[PDB]
Amino acid sequence: VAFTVDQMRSLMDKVTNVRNMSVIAHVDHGKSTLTDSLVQRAGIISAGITIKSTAISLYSEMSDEDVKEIKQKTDGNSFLINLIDSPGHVDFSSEVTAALRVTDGALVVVDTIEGVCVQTETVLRQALGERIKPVVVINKVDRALLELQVSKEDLYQTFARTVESVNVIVSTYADEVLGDVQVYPARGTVAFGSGLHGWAFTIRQFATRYAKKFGVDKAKMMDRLWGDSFFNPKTKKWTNKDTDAEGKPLERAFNMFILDPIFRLFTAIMNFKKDEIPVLLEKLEIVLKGDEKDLEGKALLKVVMRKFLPAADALLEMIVLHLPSPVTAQAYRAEQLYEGPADDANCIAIKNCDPKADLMLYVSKMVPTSDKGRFYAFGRVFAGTVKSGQKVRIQGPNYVPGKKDDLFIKAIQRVVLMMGRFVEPIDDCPAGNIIGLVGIDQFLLKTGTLTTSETAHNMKVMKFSVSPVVQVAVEVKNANDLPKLVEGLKRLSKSDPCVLTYMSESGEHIVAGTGELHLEICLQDLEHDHAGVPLKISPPVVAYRETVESESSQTALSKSPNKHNRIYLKAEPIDEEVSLAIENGIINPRDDFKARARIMADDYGWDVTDARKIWCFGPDGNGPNLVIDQTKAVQYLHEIKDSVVAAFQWATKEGPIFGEEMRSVRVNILDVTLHADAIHRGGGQIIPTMRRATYAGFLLADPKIQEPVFLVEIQCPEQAVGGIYSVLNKKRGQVVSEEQRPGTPLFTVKAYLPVNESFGFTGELRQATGGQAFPQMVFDHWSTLGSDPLDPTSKAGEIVLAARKRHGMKEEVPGWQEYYDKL
Amino acid sequence: AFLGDGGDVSFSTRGTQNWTVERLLQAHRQLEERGYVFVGYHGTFLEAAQSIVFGGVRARSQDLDAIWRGFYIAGDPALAYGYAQDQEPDARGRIRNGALLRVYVPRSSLPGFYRTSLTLAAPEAAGEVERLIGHPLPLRLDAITGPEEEGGHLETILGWPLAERTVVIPSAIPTDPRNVGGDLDPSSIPDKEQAISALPDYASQPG
Numbered sequence A: 001v002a003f004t005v006d007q008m009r010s011l012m013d014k015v016t017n018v019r020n021m022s023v024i025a026h027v028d029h030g031k032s033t034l035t036d037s038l039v040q041r042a043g044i045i046s047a048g049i050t051i052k053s054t055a056i057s058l059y060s061e062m063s064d065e066d067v068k069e070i071k072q073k074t075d076g077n078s079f080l081i082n083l084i085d086s087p088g089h090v091d092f093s094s095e096v097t098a099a100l101r102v103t104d105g106a107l108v109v110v111d112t113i114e115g116v117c118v119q120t121e122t123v124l125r126q127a128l129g130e131r132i133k134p135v136v137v138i139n140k141v142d143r144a145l146l147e148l149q150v151s152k153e154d155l156y157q158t159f160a161r162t163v164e165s166v167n168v169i170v171s172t173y174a175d176e177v178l179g180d181v182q183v184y185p186a187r188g189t190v191a192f193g194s195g196l197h198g199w200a201f202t203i204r205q206f207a208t209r210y211a212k213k214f215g216v217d218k219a220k221m222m223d224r225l226w227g228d229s230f231f232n233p234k235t236k237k238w239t240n241k242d243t244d245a246e247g248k249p250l251e252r253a254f255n256m257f258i259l260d261p262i263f264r265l266f267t268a269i270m271n272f273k274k275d276e277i278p279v280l281l282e283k284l285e286i287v288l289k290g291d292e293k294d295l296e297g298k299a300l301l302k303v304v305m306r307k308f309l310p311a312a313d314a315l316l317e318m319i320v321l322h323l324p325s326p327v328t329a330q331a332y333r334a335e336q337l338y339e340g341p342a343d344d345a346n347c348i349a350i351k352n353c354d355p356k357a358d359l360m361l362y363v364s365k366m367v368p369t370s371d372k373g374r375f376y377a378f379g380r381v382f383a384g385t386v387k388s389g390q391k392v393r394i395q396g397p398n399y400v401p402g403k404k405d406d407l408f409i410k411a412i413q414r415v416v417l418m419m420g421r422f423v424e425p426i427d428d429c430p431a432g433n434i435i436g437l438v439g440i441d442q443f444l445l446k447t448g449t450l451t452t453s454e455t456a457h458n459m460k461v462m463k464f465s466v467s468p469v470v471q472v473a474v475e476v477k478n479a480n481d482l483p484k485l486v487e488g489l490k491r492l493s494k495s496d497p498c499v500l501t502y503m504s505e506s507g508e509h510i511v512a513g514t515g516e517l518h519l520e521i522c523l524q525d526l527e528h529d530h531a532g533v534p535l536k537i538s539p540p541v542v543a544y545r546e547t548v549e550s551e552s553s554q555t556a557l558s559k560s561p562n563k564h565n566r567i568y569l570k571a572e573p574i575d576e577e578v579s580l581a582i583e584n585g586i587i588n589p590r591d592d593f594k595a596r597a598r599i600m601a602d603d604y605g606w607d608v609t610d611a612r613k614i615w616c617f618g619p620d621g622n623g624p625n626l627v628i629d630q631t632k633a634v635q636y637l638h639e640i641k642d643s644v645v646a647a648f649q650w651a652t653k654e655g656p657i658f659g660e661e662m663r664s665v666r667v668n669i670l671d672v673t674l675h676a677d678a679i680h681r682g683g684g685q686i687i688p689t690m691r692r693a694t695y696a697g698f699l700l701a702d703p704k705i706q707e708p709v710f711l712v713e714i715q716c717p718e719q720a721v722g723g724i725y726s727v728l729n730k731k732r733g734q735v736v737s738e739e740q741r742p743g744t745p746l747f748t749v750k751a752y753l754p755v756n757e758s759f760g761f762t763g764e765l766r767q768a769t770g771g772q773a774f775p776q777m778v779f780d781h782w783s784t785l786g787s788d789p790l791d792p793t794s795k796a797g798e799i800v801l802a803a804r805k806r807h808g809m810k811e812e813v814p815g816w817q818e819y820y821d822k823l
Numbered sequence B: 001a002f003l004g005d006g007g008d009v010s011f012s013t014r015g016t017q018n019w020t021v022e023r024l025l026q027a028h029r030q031l032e033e034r035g036y037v038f039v040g041y042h043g044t045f046l047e048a049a050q051s052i053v054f055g056g057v058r059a060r061s062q063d064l065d066a067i068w069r070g071f072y073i074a075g076d077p078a079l080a081y082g083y084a085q086d087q088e089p090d091a092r093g094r095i096r097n098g099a100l101l102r103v104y105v106p107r108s109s110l111p112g113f114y115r116t117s118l119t120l121a122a123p124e125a126a127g128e129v130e131r132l133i134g135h136p137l138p139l140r141l142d143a144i145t146g147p148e149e150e151g152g153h154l155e156t157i158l159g160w161p162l163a164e165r166t167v168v169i170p171s172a173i174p175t176d177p178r179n180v181g182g183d184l185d186p187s188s189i190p191d192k193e194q195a196i197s198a199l200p201d202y203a204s205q206p207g
């Protein structure tokens, strides 16, 4: 259905008639299939710039008496439904949470035969933790009929057990502040059908049919169409007794009025009984058209079924009638989603879904666009209204009301509707609606909170990190495909803000990610989409850091190739506080050298003399490494500054130990001697001198290496929590805390896990918890190894040696004399 | 072709491709079998090495006095090593390591090789050099060997005419990509290359 921007706005205005929900289903259970039925039926089209489909808009219309059955405030017959896209595998736990956090309802798909799988159960558990209301659809009924050839009663009992399993999970993990939220077929919160053939139904749909021909309000009718209600065909009487007077078995209403009609069609059509089919179709008033009237077998069955019981209608029915609106849901979701006081003005504004109050917009993810390499901020307005041009407070993850850390007060370019793959600019957007934002991707990496109050805290933050802790070397198998790989890496880097493609000094094409799985799919996307050429990929390697933890035993000295220039320097460790400050923007390279110096002196115990003489950061001109000018009366010193800085950028990117980046390394230039003539002190002369002096100084300051460490957060039922510790105990894991969700048997375990111990971690955790555990890990900190990297037998040295061999370097780490002036 | 048998030879930061000590030993032998003799090393940057090995040594304008113009090599690789690198950074300030090249001349040119104790490229030595080669500078189909600077290494200057008759092949001595500006480590010089690096005996007197 095509709509104009005006109609969309009028639709987003009545937020009581909006449905924010997602689909919880295993890929193998026709998740995408049922989703297709919805978009092909109620998908909203709009009467240039494309994006990666993140959300879909659906429109549903109902009757005055249909709306009356809705137990929440409503306004009109029109309904706007936001179908939020979700990951295909639970391994993508971080983005599973992101999807659920911006939703209020959930369509849970389960299989007829296999019932509820372990994955779906785990995800549903998380959804309930977010206080999300579920509606269930039992999919793949076709298999029970065509393959298993079950009886009507068998099929019924199968559904009953399925519904029972689901409600055991619901009653256990649903929050008590929501009331009875279990699903009941007789109440219309459970649908049955087959996405494959495109048909589905609810008890309410059949209740509407028989309501008339039984002279009964459909309320009482559908109460009978499930459970122990029996209509005696001989007496034309209703009963709760499954036997007549003579003790003969009675068929339940569900089997008689619902399953029987379906079973009869399946039997008539699939057995090619050309004489029955017509009579059977007229009976149910199923009209075919020309070409369709010649079909047979599955072909005919698919056409008859999907026009007899259109799948999308059954689903939309439940969604509109039973899934909560933003107004209803936010009333009990606010506290949970606000990392601050519950009686705050903003938290209250979220409970009331107040369009007038201060803006409270949640950014769940950044979406790749065709507008160059820019990303659009995808999220949801919980309070106030977002407007094009409106200047907002962009609060990053580490932001806290009081400090100005992780804060950016900028203006929103354009507010846009995210219609799947397309974008539609609009003026404003009231609270309760999902929306996209333009011109924020340079202040938000992924997640964040947008406000307008100078006292508002962040909303429940989703931990993320861009730090590339794992990487691989990418190489083409056929040398002619080189150009295709070059542009492939270029566009892989644009499809995700957390992916990193660069070139080492040796020319290698490097691809770095945030985790094993993350890097895995990136290399799959690269070899099939962004490049498409056969690739030679090396085994995954963990990124390390080179550091020093003491001052250079002696002054480092290095001469230029022409022997006319000398640099005297000394290396020393930088405090972790300072390194963190630099990585957190507190100490900024782009900052006023005097304002920055005051901060380092006052808050970090630096000599403001030194702090004012910072020449550069590194690597990339912003890393946790510094060059301090501590020379006295050196002529033309400023004329080599650009060369010294350049040398530092290369020195800090690939250290002398084994080619890894430096961290927390401070270099003090003590003295410099230069040739009077500028011809003999250019870049070619100074750069090598500075680099080698830096190396010499580094190796004189007892070198060390640092390893990346994850912070892991795991949800898991008390019963299987034991497996979590079993796995951590052989991964050098370190338990931070164990907390239990009050009332439920769900435990949250947080622990530190070395990145080089995390390979195949989710697989082992899966194995050890029966798939009950829900892993979630983000880069936390760097950890210095105690062992000596210069010792080939030690833990650190063992790592070094392996890397050096792998890079074709000389096995033994070079001595400082190698880079020191040869004399 | 004087590069021996194997794959396509190329120059890289990672080192000279398809060039083992064994292949060098074959290329060297086949050179001598054709009346060529080794006269020293030339260190330069990667693109220059590609130019020299595949296009040949070609005369060009260099930054010195006209009378001393020519192709400069060194008997000791350590000396030539210092020139085996970029002299100019790119936009990002990257200074790559270069490559050591072996220089061969026809033996028919040996009668034009002279040696001196004076320091070359200096006005005080111009007279003695012009005496030995039997004609005014610059050097032509002749060469001069002497200290590059007082009390320093010996350097050889091949007159441009002679330089353009050389055959230049890669050395099995690598430059260090992780120590650009460092000195040649004697331990990194293949023993089997050292064995074929003897220099000819140069004349101390006029022809």
Ligand SMILES: NC(=O)c1ccc[n+]([C@@H]2O[C@H](COP(=O)([O-])OP(=O)(O)OC[C@H]3O[C@@H](n4cnc5c(N)ncnc54)[C@H](O)[C@@H]3O)[C@@H](O)[C@H]2O)c1
Pocket: B041, B042, B043, B044, B045, B047, B048, B049, B051, B052, B055, B056, B057, B058, B059, B060, B062, B063, B064, B071, B072, B073, B074, B079, B080, B081, B083, B148, B155, B156
């Ligand atoms: N380069 C050496 O190995 C070496 C040896 C002894 C002494 N030196 C000293 O270095 C100074 C000159 O250095 P240089 O000779 O390397 O630079 P140069 O200025 O004399 O010559 C310029 C560059 O052109 C390059 N080149 C590229 N293609 C070429 C080609 N086809 N033919 C010839 N050259 C080509 C050479 O590598 C050389 O580096 C001399 O004054 C001498 O004192 C150098």
